[PDB]
Amino acid sequence: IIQAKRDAKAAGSYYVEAQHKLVFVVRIKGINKIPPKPRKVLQLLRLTRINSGTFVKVTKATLELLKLIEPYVAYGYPSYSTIRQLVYKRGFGKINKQRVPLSDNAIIEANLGKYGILSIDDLIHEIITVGPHFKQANNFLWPFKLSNPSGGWGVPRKFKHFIQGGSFGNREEFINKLVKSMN
Amino acid sequence: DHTSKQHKRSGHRTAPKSDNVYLKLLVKLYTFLARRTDAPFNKVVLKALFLSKINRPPVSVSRIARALKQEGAANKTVVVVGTVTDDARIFEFPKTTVAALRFTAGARAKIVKAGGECITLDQLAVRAPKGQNTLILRGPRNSREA
Amino acid sequence: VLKKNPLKNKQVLLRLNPYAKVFAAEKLGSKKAEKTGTKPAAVFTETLKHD
Amino acid sequence: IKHSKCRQEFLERVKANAAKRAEAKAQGVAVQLKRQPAQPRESRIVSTEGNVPQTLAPVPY
Amino acid sequence: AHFKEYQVIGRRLPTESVPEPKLFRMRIFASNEVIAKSRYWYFLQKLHKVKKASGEIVSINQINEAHPTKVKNFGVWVRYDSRSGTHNMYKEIRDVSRVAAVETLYQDMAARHRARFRSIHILKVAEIEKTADVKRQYVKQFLTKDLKFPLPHRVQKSTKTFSYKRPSTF
RNA sequence: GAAAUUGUUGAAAGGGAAGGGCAUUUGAUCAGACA
RNA sequence: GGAAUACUGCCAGCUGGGACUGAGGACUGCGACGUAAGUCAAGGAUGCUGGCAUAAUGGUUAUAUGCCGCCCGUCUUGAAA
RNA sequence: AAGCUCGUAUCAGUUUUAUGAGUAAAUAUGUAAGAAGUCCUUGUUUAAUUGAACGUGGACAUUUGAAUGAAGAGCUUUUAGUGGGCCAUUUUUGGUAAGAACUGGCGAUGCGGGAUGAACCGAACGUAGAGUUAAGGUGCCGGAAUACACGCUCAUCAGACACCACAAAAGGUGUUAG
RNA sequence: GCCCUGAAAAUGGAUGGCGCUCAAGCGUGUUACCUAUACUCUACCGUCAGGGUUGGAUGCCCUGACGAGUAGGCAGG
RNA sequence: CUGACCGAGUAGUGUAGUGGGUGACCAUACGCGAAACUCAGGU
């Protein structure tokens, strides 16, 4: 990507990165006083409780859902390091009906080898590099229970758009910093 | 946050309401068989044992003959979880083995006369641990006034 | 009984991913790049500094 | 009272999907008849060789 | 923290019969790339018929100051929306760089006019190389040759809460 | 031979209320075990 | 024309100090260091040392102080009224 | 509450695809996204088994007909309390200064903040240990910077943080900038 | 933009008080700080759910989620 | 009687602020988004 950018710049052209196919969404507001529409949208995304997030496939259907829950969630484009740290620290794989930690590659293999994923690294690759079995891996991963950001959210008031100096909204590149503090 | 009920109980029974000692022994035996055999027959028999008296209508001896007339069912063993009641409407009873919790005096006498052999559920399980060559008959439920 | 955390206690990290041992050999984080003389095009530079 | 193209297009798409399934069974290939939502646009190279990028300078006031 | 300058170019994503639009560009001041892109979209939507859904940012690059260490008299034209109808405003700020000049302008507008960031429009900022064309007295006074002034009533800061010397100024 | 109420002796506190909750200092009192 | 620094992100880079927790209870499993024997920071604390062996720690209560606490039941869309 | 029959189960207070409904949007409202479906052939009211209808032969099993999520779906018996509630938001009407339609709260609600509050901002509650935050604050009462940086105020009832219990036009030879 | 009038009553009174004027007032920007029964990590009681157990069976072990509440229902004491 | 970077991203509208304003009202960010109208063609 960087080589293509340099070539375009040196040849009187402006290379544009492909629109990100993966986003990370973290709940920012509580349960009380949530209108039914955003409440149902968050429920479908498995954002049961505040300071919890899940990986969402970037699609026009999911984009419209995110548009509705915009005031209540903060999301962006996670980096490889952030995804790896999340999977290694808060990585809990869904088994029949219980939340079991991914403490060994054997556990992942016994419940996700049907699709060729048999190790935590393979799951991380499928998540960051959205593949055909992205939905299966995303559903298999339990929603991440994230702590509050160490050092504060960095804004006087959370309930404002990121463009307006708040916390929610689109923080595409700054989502990694928030995730690292919250992880 | 929650989406379903805070705490939801299972929609199936665990132990019979009756305190009969012998019935509980059969329940224990069938639970062990179902857990260590996974046979659908054992699971069905275990589930039927938890049904109440109303939900366990008696099966007439004529109804046993009804099933035995099916193609290939002449030699199948008939298992009735409830009680087998006699029926004078049938004048000839095919010679067959019947397994049930309780057998009425008339039904037992008719079965013995017809060359059959009344048997308890435990004996049937001993003969058929996996429920092979077994037939299950459930008595009419709409018959009871409701 | 207790969930141990990767990124520290390197035994668990090596258990989860044997490639971590190979990662350390070259360290896979400080690899030297290759310099190139791809000077930016005149149009881009003119449009950047100028309005 | 209501009878519109809503269902007619569904049957037309069903027929098209059946034809595509027949084609993919005759020739080895993924059936690919499952509709997919609009996907993000891929990367591409844009050049200003044709027209210089003008500056708007939001003067209107 | 400090404001950043980004060059933002929009494409107005092409389609058949509408290929390769003119690639409009703008100069945007913002603290981060996201805010710069949002402001660029806000200006573009008002200027002509374009939208974020039907457009994309061709490229964003930070415009570093050519001479970060040099005193310049920056001429500023700003349209600010007060409680009543908005009106034009021309200001001059003696600063070291465009970023610093814009940062000082924002504070000056917020203080002397209560104009918030939402209501501030940056029409144009241009360095004034000439000297005879300066029109604002408060910046002109600083251009006098060999200018020297004192700092009367200097006040010091004390770490301890109690002082025995009863300090003085200068 | 109970409580409401009262007197004697011992202890404690009390500047227009008392009583209660988390938390500790001081006074009194108290059970247990030591190849 | 030759460089750094600033900003930014990465390091399955190193390391000092402080706080809480010691839950499980003979082995079985996943891993690392070793030619091997074996060892280990690898599915939950071990090793050594000192004082006391008693009102020393600790419980009950009298009372000292940091903060809080409105008067019980019924009724009322609502009460301390 | 008691449960009964089935079980991967069809579903969804949500989006996307297709289009009705509207000089006429937006929000919503209606139907579908098929295995209980599609196709070739063929048996038992039209002039004609021409066709409807239900069967047999044959072709496709699951990228099988969009996304996401689902402590499963349906079914039977019976019953304790309420059937007058109050506050807040949007639309409509009325109006110098209340009546109908929507959704969220209190009533049934603790905890932090607004010195207190039922309608407010956070957040909904097992008993404990450590850490990070929300709103709210960093002169003392009151735990936190008499923190940093840019501009304005002399007020003889200044000023001091939405709901809070709230005034402007206008006048001033007060003051700052256009 | 800031200030006075515009905004006149009756016991004495309240940005909450003390109190403050390059504010400890006003608009805005930048940092570190205090914490709720909220969030993150862990110990324990209980409810629920999924498994193991023929060698105190309603018994014992492992795993996962949760604990608001008036009228009222059930269950265990 | 059709196409259009044509009205116009205008009117209008869902969502959020301890946003401004005594009030009337207004601006911002996440979106949707027209018609009459204009040019040409049609008849």
From Swiss-Prot, chain A:
GO terms for molecular function: RNA binding; structural constituent of ribosome. This is Large ribosomal subunit protein uL30A. It comes from Saccharomyces cerevisiae (strain ATCC 204508 / S288c). GO terms for cellular component: cytoplasm; cytosol; cytosolic large ribosomal subunit. Belongs to the universal ribosomal protein uL30 family. Component of the large ribosomal subunit (LSU). Mature yeast ribosomes consist of a small (40S) and a large (60S) subunit. The 40S small subunit contains 1 molecule of ribosomal RNA (18S rRNA) and 33 different proteins (encoded by 57 genes). The large 60S subunit contains 3 rRNA molecules (25S, 5.8S and 5S rRNA) and 46 different proteins (encoded by 81 genes). Component of the ribosome, a large ribonucleoprotein complex responsible for the synthesis of proteins in the cell. The small ribosomal subunit (SSU) binds messenger RNAs (mRNAs) and translates the encoded message by selecting cognate aminoacyl-transfer RNA (tRNA) molecules. The large subunit (LSU) contains the ribosomal catalytic site termed the peptidyl transferase center (PTC), which catalyzes the formation of peptide bonds, thereby polymerizing the amino acids delivered by tRNAs into a polypeptide chain. Its main location: cytoplasm. Present with 101000 molecules/cell in log phase SD medium. There are 2 genes for uL30 in yeast.
Swiss-Prot record, chain B:
The modification N6,N6,N6-trimethyllysine is found at K47. Keywords: Cytoplasm, Isopeptide bond, Methylation, Ribonucleoprotein, Ribosomal protein, Ubl conjugation. There is a cross-link at K113 (Glycyl lysine isopeptide (Lys-Gly) (interchain with G-Cter in ubiquitin)). GO terms for molecular function: RNA binding; structural constituent of ribosome. It comes from the Eukaryota. GO terms for biological process: cytoplasmic translation. It is found in: Cytoplasm. Its main location: cytoplasm. GO terms for cellular component: cytosol; cytosolic large ribosomal subunit. Transmembrane segments: none annotated. Component of the ribosome, a large ribonucleoprotein complex responsible for the synthesis of proteins in the cell. The small ribosomal subunit (SSU) binds messenger RNAs (mRNAs) and translates the encoded message by selecting cognate aminoacyl-transfer RNA (tRNA) molecules. The large subunit (LSU) contains the ribosomal catalytic site termed the peptidyl transferase center (PTC), which catalyzes the formation of peptide bonds, thereby polymerizing the amino acids delivered by tRNAs into a polypeptide chain. Component of the large ribosomal subunit (LSU). Mature yeast ribosomes consist of a small (40S) and a large (60S) subunit. The 40S small subunit contains 1 molecule of ribosomal RNA (18S rRNA) and 33 different proteins (encoded by 57 genes). The large 60S subunit contains 3 rRNA molecules (25S, 5.8S and 5S rRNA) and 46 different proteins (encoded by 81 genes). eL18 interacts with NAP1. Belongs to the eukaryotic ribosomal protein eL18 family. There are 2 genes for eL18 in yeast.
From Swiss-Prot, chain C:
It is found in: Cytoplasm; Nucleus. Changing F23A: Leads to an inefficient release from ACL4 with a delayed assembly into the 60S subunit. N-terminally acetylated by acetyltransferase NatA. The eukaryote-specific C-terminal extension harbors a nuclear import signal and delivers the ACL4-uL4/RPL4 complex to the pre-ribosome, triggering uL4 release from ACL4 and incorporation into the 60S ribosomal subunit. Component of the large ribosomal subunit (LSU). Mature yeast ribosomes consist of a small (40S) and a large (60S) subunit. The 40S small subunit contains 1 molecule of ribosomal RNA (18S rRNA) and 33 different proteins (encoded by 57 genes). The large 60S subunit contains 3 rRNA molecules (25S, 5.8S and 5S rRNA) and 46 different proteins (encoded by 81 genes). uL4 is associated with the polypeptide exit tunnel. uL4 interacts with its chaperone ACL4 and the nuclear import receptor KAP104. There are 2 genes for uL4 in yeast. Belongs to the universal ribosomal protein uL4 family. This is Large ribosomal subunit protein uL4A. It comes from Saccharomyces cerevisiae (strain ATCC 204508 / S288c) (Baker's yeast). The chain holds residues 312 to 362 of 362 of the full protein.
From Swiss-Prot, chain D:
It comes from the Eukaryota. It is found in: Cytoplasm. It comes from Saccharomyces cerevisiae (strain ATCC 204508 / S288c) (Baker's yeast). This is Large ribosomal subunit protein eL21A. The chain holds residues 96 to 156 of 160 of the full protein. There are 2 genes for eL21 in yeast. Component of the ribosome, a large ribonucleoprotein complex responsible for the synthesis of proteins in the cell. The small ribosomal subunit (SSU) binds messenger RNAs (mRNAs) and translates the encoded message by selecting cognate aminoacyl-transfer RNA (tRNA) molecules. The large subunit (LSU) contains the ribosomal catalytic site termed the peptidyl transferase center (PTC), which catalyzes the formation of peptide bonds, thereby polymerizing the amino acids delivered by tRNAs into a polypeptide chain. Transmembrane segments: none annotated. Belongs to the eukaryotic ribosomal protein eL21 family. The lineage of its organism: Eukaryota, Fungi, Dikarya, Ascomycota, Saccharomycotina. Component of the large ribosomal subunit (LSU). Mature yeast ribosomes consist of a small (40S) and a large (60S) subunit. The 40S small subunit contains 1 molecule of ribosomal RNA (18S rRNA) and 33 different proteins (encoded by 57 genes). The large 60S subunit contains 3 rRNA molecules (25S, 5.8S and 5S rRNA) and 46 different proteins (encoded by 81 genes).
